[PDB]
């Protein structure tokens, strides 16, 4: 019973680790196009601010 | 930062930021198998190296002027001439840099707190020197709209964009022992002990109105500590009260609620010697440590479905002195920092259950992934000198590696905030409802399984043939002359 | 790695060696004094003075109590490391080209060159030591055995002992390697024919169960002691003077080069005699490390695998401390297999 | 700093025949085998502990190897300047001379082109080429007050860290803070003992280099060995007579009987005489030249053994020279212990714990250790020092043993069993801590190192907070610190800059303000140095009578001053022969009187450098007055300045009218901390008057004694004492609520107002030391008032 609970705990922990890692990887992949768009907008603003200064 | 995170092949984690390997300030990834070194740059900093809040710039100390190292392959794009400086820190929105000289020169005269605007590249202000207390002595608001410092008899409030003086005034309030800005727009929590005619109080003040919106007198207190929740939802105050025997007899927790009408107050706790408190990141649970039992006791608190926040679990007494929570809320580290052994214990939450307990010989320093996957802990050579190392570990209870480092100075992860967050992303996180899922990780492991093939096979065969040759000689030698083969000279 | 440069010798280097704990480095050159250096910072600890000729070989015992040198002046000397004094000299009828201690420090061999009419030989000497202090008590003026050049081989040029001193392995001026059985009165056991030129170095793996050869014929061979099977071949376009097997990582370091002579070297191209690192198992060149102004004549690796030193025909020793990129250097199948563990 | 001139100087020195000769001797030292490992470890680590026995060569060769490496090898350090601290003046001077010789320097330390120098209190031997400085720990601490980062120093070496002195431990706290601020500073800790782990741990587990080294072995004989070898028989009727551990079964039944029945609570002086006679008879020791050093718990046992040696026919010959070494003796009599005896004469030095640390007698070969001391205990509730000490610690006994073995092999005879030694405590109770902390607290505040409480909490062994509070209360009472804050007053800033006790420093500053600096600097030198009065063995009553013939104004302080004036006169009028004749007639140490002149001139220079000039119009003391007795008015002023420095040390004379004219009753004094007797060496021992006594020190021996006393009058106490209360109805004036004077109410109010005037003038003068007070009406009236009290 101790070995069974230890195996079930290890499997639950391993499944939790994978879920968190895959969730963060998925969030980052969906964020890439937004980061690129935000970089283009920031580059325009920095260029306008430089020209104005 | 974001681009590199997409393009680069691995599998699967964070970027550093290492002081230690060699006489060099050095760049690494987290490639699961090892951290792989990207660069090692000889004498890049002359004291300490600091990241910008999104990791955008690297702030590098040179004794002839602080430098902001930018561009993908790293060069100085901006450098600020202030010597005698040791403190070199940003506004939380990456727009302004504050430099402080605790060593007077004729650089400061006597304007030792110098504020540099990153967007222009110019010194906007200097403010004359300081004696008290912990850095930051001059504290920004979350938006970077306001900036302030205490005079003991008067709070002075300074204003972005030009670093003016708010209302053309400073707020004549006396006896302040510390002040903390809210994450929420825009509020200061500050507190006053027994000052002559005035009994002790905690004040919540709104700005730019400048009104003491919630004051509570606390009465006869040795000390208090003001702990904001990370979104500004709550202010917890940790209050140590005094009987007529002149003792710190009992710690109380009193929680102000800031979204709720007319700022109601949850009085929660009464207990012996509370030495640490920490909120759940982005949430509403909390964990607490109590002294003198004679090992340190741990108490765990959750929010009830009927309202109030209340004790829910405890665990037996331990060596943990520092409570360090994951940015993803679930995992909390209970760490006995500055102990020779053990002393790192790991708890999964809701309903606080201990997952693992591990080594880190002479542990000093501790940090997490911004999304909670990895823990890194280190032993600075400024702190300790019997092992000197960094230790890298996965949230589960699996060590990745421990790498001893010869005169180890520092480790810091490069910041990586989640780029956007929304109701549909929060919905996608709930999609598989709770049971298991099998959509992503099995495909990444299949990709890794593909990475064992095509020219790879001949090399796998070579590795194998070598291990076999070696086992054969290993056997023979044990039998013939009782000798154990090795690849490095034993201790 | 980071490198610093040790200068002391004004003459081409002939041998560098680390001691067992890897905190001292010993070197000899065509000068008549040897030097001892701290391997941490390259500071010179002191010198060994008394020979009158090039010192070809230096070795240090497993206790770091004595080192032994072989010289062009037709002598071998034994030195006390803590005060740099000579405690014993043997005279030789021929120059001595190489010396090495047995793994436990009770014997050393010396290669006696085949000059004038001498056929050459590997001499074995015994040092009787106090079992507590490891100080010597007796040295005999005679070797306790002389392995005269075997019938059919040219003279030995290099030799070393295998694990527990059970075999002596030798390399010869005709590119052969031969093996001698220490228990059986050093009798000839076997030989292999590897190189088209003389064997210029031969060094052992950390456990002494295999070794690596090098030759000016551009090739290097990894060879098993017990069978003399050739395990690996590293093929170069460069005449080699020296080679080593690294601890910790599965790497090989090779070194040699061809003196420039008549062609002009530009300032951009100066300092480009290199050591080449190969992967031991895959036989693949993985790096070249520059810094020398003439051929590399000797390379040594610390037994901890944390630095290496090279001595050049330029009269310098470059001392190298490995960095994190070196320790983490891994083929993709090596990352895979190291993770398969857990 | 262009090092090339100094590198070229060193290369020239290395070519000298002197350097090459001494290099061959240096190569024989144990530490030389570790030269390259020491240098390489110091390159890799900012802090290193170097542990190894005395005589291994550490203190000479570790600083030398570091100097050699920094000059010859292009280390990335742009700077080569090494400081090596020593607890002892003689060690700083002798090590610098030895290393200067080993460097091939011809002019000695601080000579032209000398790479090595030394600096001790009142003596500096360094030049612009000096890159290795040996100094006393308190010299480096003063340099830290001038340069808080030691900006011009590259390497600090703290030697003899195992002595665990207050100044060493204090320096280690400061150096730990500087090592956090400066990445370029290196620290070496040198120890003779094996507790290198505590120092390693305290500096973040820094590397320990263990140098295997004998050097200069001391053979140890325990009480059982001494009894066996001497043939000593314990007589059953002797005052030393009061399952024997199986360990003793190897000794004779006589020795077993002597060990079983010998009183462990008495020092067997008869066994010391037999042991001394055995050293001359024994074939083992008879041919060994050297001095014998005997550790005794105090002056009474020194006298008892001196009398036994003087009366014993075995020791009556010109073959022995018996010398006492005790804290009570003059600096000249203490200096006699360092003089070599004539050839064939055995020197016997009878010493307390004064020989146990900080002092080196180079010719000691034999140590006799009684294993006993007398120790100062401070009682906080009474503010009294008591002298009551028992067995020494193991650390103390090993340091006594190590008095043999310094220059050559030696012998240590322990007048206690091996088992008794094994049962000694390892360390004495708070060697650094048990002492008063006021000078330490003053120094902490002078260096702006925070509160004394918070700073001392960081010590290896923190003192009790009550000791710190008491020390701070004394600094507040003196006026060195503000009343509510740990901040130095202008007086405190001047006191912290003077190399003397706060009470003596206040006396010097007041001596300058009252324009009496020359006599007061002589009194200050007398209070800091050993008494010039000697009491030669067997001539006590003649020495006491000669001191009484010099007695001045019922004051020990003015009696010593009068002795100095008469010596100065004898030297000026009759030269060297008159000087010696005066010293011999009055039992004075000439060397002590010379040191008093040197210390006086330097104290005057330091007070003048602080801006306190003596007025050029008082030609009264600087010009030719070696021929005049002090006027009564000058005596009154000197007593007043003594009270201004020492007021915390006042007591009321308990006059008891003797019934019997023949009983010389000792003068009894009531102090704020209880009753005491005037010490028998005082001219006031038999003082039979009502009044007030000032004292320098209150010490517990068998009784509580007041040392170095002065009879004082009311006006000094009223002007410079603690709080004045006026009892208008009773016509009584109280000072600190316990000192009572009968005064008309108007006179009592006058003194209360005169203090406000004094404090106003003193404050202005302490804030601006260069301000002239010559025409100050207030100072003139106070000086006139003090001068009138005895008319």
Tab-separated table of N, CA and C in Angstrom, chain C residues 23-24 36-41 43-46 81-83, chain D residues 27 32-41 43-44 65 69:
chain	number	residue	atom	x	y	z
C	23	UNK	N	48.050	20.491	-7.652
C	23	UNK	CA	48.428	21.831	-7.232
C	23	UNK	C	49.847	22.265	-7.594
C	24	UNK	N	50.749	21.376	-8.001
C	24	UNK	CA	52.030	21.858	-8.515
C	24	UNK	C	52.300	21.432	-9.941
C	36	UNK	N	59.503	24.604	-10.632
C	36	UNK	CA	58.322	24.092	-9.988
C	36	UNK	C	57.402	25.268	-9.869
C	37	UNK	N	56.129	25.097	-10.240
C	37	UNK	CA	55.161	26.206	-10.238
C	37	UNK	C	53.880	25.788	-9.547
C	38	UNK	N	53.219	26.742	-8.871
C	38	UNK	CA	51.865	26.555	-8.387
C	38	UNK	C	50.997	26.582	-9.580
C	39	UNK	N	50.158	25.549	-9.663
C	39	UNK	CA	49.242	25.395	-10.765
C	39	UNK	C	48.003	26.262	-10.661
C	40	UNK	N	47.757	26.875	-9.513
C	40	UNK	CA	46.638	27.833	-9.315
C	40	UNK	C	46.851	29.162	-10.059
C	41	UNK	N	48.065	29.666	-10.075
C	41	UNK	CA	48.211	31.039	-10.513
C	41	UNK	C	49.424	31.184	-11.376
C	43	UNK	N	52.540	31.047	-10.299
C	43	UNK	CA	53.648	31.568	-9.518
C	43	UNK	C	54.759	30.524	-9.437
C	44	UNK	N	56.012	30.963	-9.553
C	44	UNK	CA	57.137	30.058	-9.478
C	44	UNK	C	57.490	29.701	-8.035
C	45	UNK	N	57.519	28.427	-7.715
C	45	UNK	CA	57.739	28.047	-6.333
C	45	UNK	C	59.226	27.978	-6.147
C	46	UNK	N	59.948	27.439	-7.124
C	46	UNK	CA	61.410	27.430	-7.052
C	46	UNK	C	62.003	26.635	-8.198
C	81	UNK	N	61.489	17.551	-3.017
C	81	UNK	CA	60.656	18.597	-3.493
C	81	UNK	C	60.553	19.758	-2.512
C	82	UNK	N	60.560	19.482	-1.187
C	82	UNK	CA	60.325	20.553	-0.210
C	82	UNK	C	61.511	21.517	-0.062
C	83	UNK	N	62.726	21.118	-0.411
C	83	UNK	CA	63.829	22.092	-0.286
C	83	UNK	C	64.646	22.246	-1.575
D	27	UNK	N	66.021	29.272	3.894
D	27	UNK	CA	65.661	28.019	3.218
D	27	UNK	C	65.614	26.801	4.153
D	32	UNK	N	59.459	27.737	4.754
D	32	UNK	CA	60.030	27.907	3.418
D	32	UNK	C	59.606	26.782	2.468
D	33	UNK	N	59.384	25.565	2.985
D	33	UNK	CA	58.852	24.435	2.198
D	33	UNK	C	57.447	24.693	1.652
D	34	UNK	N	56.707	25.594	2.292
D	34	UNK	CA	55.350	25.965	1.914
D	34	UNK	C	55.297	27.302	1.168
D	35	UNK	N	56.444	27.911	0.815
D	35	UNK	CA	56.522	29.234	0.172
D	35	UNK	C	55.563	29.363	-1.011
D	36	UNK	N	55.660	28.455	-1.977
D	36	UNK	CA	54.890	28.556	-3.222
D	36	UNK	C	53.396	28.308	-2.975
D	37	UNK	N	53.057	27.345	-2.109
D	37	UNK	CA	51.674	27.086	-1.679
D	37	UNK	C	51.054	28.280	-0.938
D	38	UNK	N	51.817	28.960	-0.074
D	38	UNK	CA	51.378	30.178	0.620
D	38	UNK	C	51.081	31.279	-0.394
D	39	UNK	N	52.035	31.576	-1.277
D	39	UNK	CA	51.884	32.624	-2.291
D	39	UNK	C	50.712	32.319	-3.229
D	40	UNK	N	50.581	31.083	-3.708
D	40	UNK	CA	49.488	30.694	-4.603
D	40	UNK	C	48.116	30.776	-3.918
D	41	UNK	N	48.018	30.368	-2.650
D	41	UNK	CA	46.764	30.471	-1.890
D	41	UNK	C	46.367	31.928	-1.681
D	43	UNK	N	47.107	34.428	-3.687
D	43	UNK	CA	46.619	34.896	-4.995
D	43	UNK	C	45.168	34.495	-5.252
D	44	UNK	N	44.757	33.314	-4.783
D	44	UNK	CA	43.408	32.768	-5.017
D	44	UNK	C	42.374	33.236	-3.989
D	65	UNK	N	57.924	36.548	1.908
D	65	UNK	CA	57.491	35.872	0.682
D	65	UNK	C	56.457	36.700	-0.070
D	69	UNK	N	57.147	38.317	-3.742
D	69	UNK	CA	56.224	38.010	-4.830
D	69	UNK	C	55.611	39.280	-5.436
